[PDB]
Ligand SMILES: Nc1ncnc2c1ncn2[C@@H]1O[C@H](COP(=O)(O)OP(=O)(O)O)[C@@H](O)[C@H]1O
């Protein structure tokens with residue numbers, strides 16, 4: 001699939017060597033562009049960062065928290081930069097010349113400046129960002145973190161030239177497309193409440209697949225995913241294989257998407273993966289076992305295997321977990337649901353409020369039939385922060 005003109009504008013400018021921030025509608029094409037950029041930019045200098053576990057596996061690796069070798073905190077630059085200045089953190093900090101980032105919406109502001117001086121102090125250069133080709137990407141109308149990074153003082157002073165993307169590539173029908181922006185900008189008519197309310201009835205989930213529901217908080221999804229599991233009668237089959245070399249919670253927590261324990265039963269809904277398939281990106285599925293041999297849509301069932309999820313712990317050092325790429329569907333968490341293109345989802349709008357959670361949830365659904373909104377979006381669902389002002393001064 002050839003790139004749009006809007007996209008290829010970004011490609012050439014990063015190839016030029018310029019720090020370039022570009023933003024885009026949910027499904028603008030943003031994160032696919034970095035797939036071409038990372039293929040375009042040359043190993044040895046590129047780091048492939050992001051702000052969640054799930055954002056880094058879509059792209060390359062490393063989750064900012066991890067790569068920087070720090071975890072925000074009230075440690076001034078001093079401890080931070082000294083914590084930045086151990087081996088693995090340094091050696092990796094020094095060699096990079098182009099630092100891609102993704103899902104910048106989530107990174108707090110203070111993290112940026114603290115990350116900022118840290119980048120300079122290690123490299124010793126007093127260029128804007130330690131003189132890194134600093135690529136950035138994300139949409140601030142999706143999930144917040146307060147104080148997004150553009151409020152940070154390093155921002156703009158890093159000299160990023162702001163670019164924009166349009167023509168949403170994920171949803172084909174303009175009727176659905178026009179919907180999200182109405183929600184995105186925080187504007188709800190009935191023709192922004194009734195198209196969906198109408199839909200609530202839908203049946204979603206082709207064959208054996210079920211609607212992967214989305215939730216406001218992480219705990220419900222932990223419970224709701226599992227309650228369904230114990231309910232399903234059959235072989236427990238909870239093999240897992242948390243084969244982590246140390247005994248550290250953080251590696252399987254932040255910096256990778258894994259749970260140490262994968263209680264995969266006989267027929268519960270297994271969703272997501274690690275891409276690396278011509279026909280299977282990150283879609284939900286289930287089937288019989290012999291080695292899960294899981295069937296998702298597309299009608300493609302093959303045998304699934306566990307791999308390596310390399311991580312850099314804080315203060316240097318590398319821990320790695322070796323678990324299966326799959327995770328339990330049934331109810332995906334919404335904050336973990338950025339950077340996702342989900343064919344079939346279902347969400348309850350009514351108690352799910354936060355400058356974005358509305359937008360972010362539905363927008364991750366290709367076509368309207370997949371989206372299984374529930375409780376009427378009686379306005380209030382669509383809340384907004386007035387960050388639109390920043391996108392508004394983008395004359
Ligand atoms: N230039 C392009 N060529 C092919 N597919 C694209 C392009 N731009 C966007 N897409 C589609 O958009 C999806 C990725 O959406 P993306 O913009 O990365 O999500 P988000 O905007 O939420 O980060 C992919 O499935 C891909 O097929």
Ligand code: ALF
Nearest residue numbers: 026139338339340
């Ligand atoms: F803006 Al995105 F996944 F990068 F919705």
